[model samples]
Target: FQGRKTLVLIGASGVGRSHIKNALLSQNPEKFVYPVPYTTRPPRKSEEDGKEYHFISTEEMTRNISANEFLEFGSYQGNMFGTKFETVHQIHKQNKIAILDIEPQTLKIVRTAELSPFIVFIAPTDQGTQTEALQQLQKDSEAIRSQYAHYFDLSLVNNGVDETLKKLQEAFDQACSSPQ
Candidate 1:
């Protein structure tokens, strides 16, 4: 198929966005692809070099920024983080949808025709088991829903891994098949 879909997965920090991200890719390796973003900021204690982000030198980042090679870029506390426009397009050229996770607030910047993005938000499962951790998860999920839920094209509760992955896969395929 010539059509391409960009799946932008969004969720609060601990809500399993990245978990679902990997599941989606692993489920349909032929149809799904990840375009890892480029960042100049140093890796965190828990983060590795390429798995989390491709760490680039400030020298190259500055050059790319000047050349407008990045799809979107911004600075925070003297560190630069951004996605290269080339990365996303490369997937499209390969006839595979580019799927990746991004912050909810970053949604507007990446939504475009070239990307053909269909945004998905993974909300915490409301299982009614109210205790410390679950309660905190519920609270955070609610806050995220209240703040930026409107931006999403689709939302899944992520009640379980397999079901959620299946839901995302089906939805993504159906959406891409129809139109932009």
Candidate 2:
């Protein structure tokens, strides 16, 4: 990637977005990839700032929006999450890349922004498989499957984890070398 490349991974809640995110983080920490900061209602005892998220007050989030600080933002389950331009800029300035696994709405905004981020939609291989996976995770499988069917860009079917990771690596390499 020439300037700054923000790779936004878009998928339904249970399509393995988190797994891919962790893969990238562990495999490419030298690239400085980090999750976008988010502010929500409050944290459970299990969550911590700068770890699970950068928790902030609703008022602070609104102030950030007014200041045009966020590159993109969206609401989920009555909580808000967003990525700021400064975060990406900082990584790019250091000649590193910032990767985010964001919701579709945030991805859309980043797509149209000045930076024009590259979006990759990570999708499940099949509905049944996705549903089963979600159910195993104790999540709303139906809702997630519906959302996966609704939004995506350049879908990559994650049928097998190891094989999918290999394919994703190839795709990432191609994207990096592709002309802007």
Candidate 3:
């Protein structure tokens, strides 16, 4: 009713959350935007600096974290990662729905009044008789839902890309138009 709210896409690794995020942005770049997250991990072969992420040193990330610059920070595979508060605010200033594909641990930090994040848990579908690794992914996704059920505004099943994207886009429109 007043301004565009933040949209958060949270799911396990193989749930296609990033795919949906990219699809939504491609469909409406003007209506949606994403802040590049910062990380200490090296870029992938196809990734460019400041594109998928802003690659930095652990020292720099640690200093910034203590200064309260990061909205959330954590480690994985001996590398640190976090999202900046300023970057998200910059997108909000442009009157666009800022989308954050964040880890579940950051949910509590971002669920404040300033961001007013509309959290969507992109749940993984039950693939019967899948690989052990895939089964683990589903388990992790379920555990996140159980722990953060109160934080989520919506729960979307990642059954198919097209169907999920359609549902996500509709939900975003509703969240912006109505006072939720």
Candidate 3: give its CA RMSD in angstroms.
Answer: 2.8
Encode model 2's per-residue lDDT on 1-180: one tens digit a residue.
543266667766767878887787787788747755767659888886787678889999999989999877788789988878788788767776677776555644665444435566665664454455555543443354355544333457777766776776666556532343
Q: By descending TM-score, how would the candidates be arranged?
A: 3, 1, 2
Candidate 1: tens digits of C-alpha lDDT, residues 75-176: 878899888878888898888888867666667777776677888888888776567887788787778778887777788998788889888777776775
Candidate 3 overall lDDT versus native: 0.84
Best by lDDT: 3
Deviation of model 1 at 61, angstroms: 1.9
Go through the candidates in order and give the C-alpha RMSD of each one to the true structure.
3.4, 4.7, 2.8
Clashes in each model (backbone N, CA, C under 3 Å)?
0, 0, 0
Clashing pairs in 3: none
* TM-score of every prediction relative to native: 0.80, 0.71, 0.84
The 0-to-1 C-alpha lDDT of every candidate, in the order given, reads: 0.80, 0.66, 0.84
Q: What 10-residue stretch in candidate 3 is worst by lDDT?
A: 171-180
- Which tens-of-lDDT digit does each residue in 24-118 have in candidate 3? 89988998888998999987788889887999988899899999999877888989988899999998888777899888888878876678678
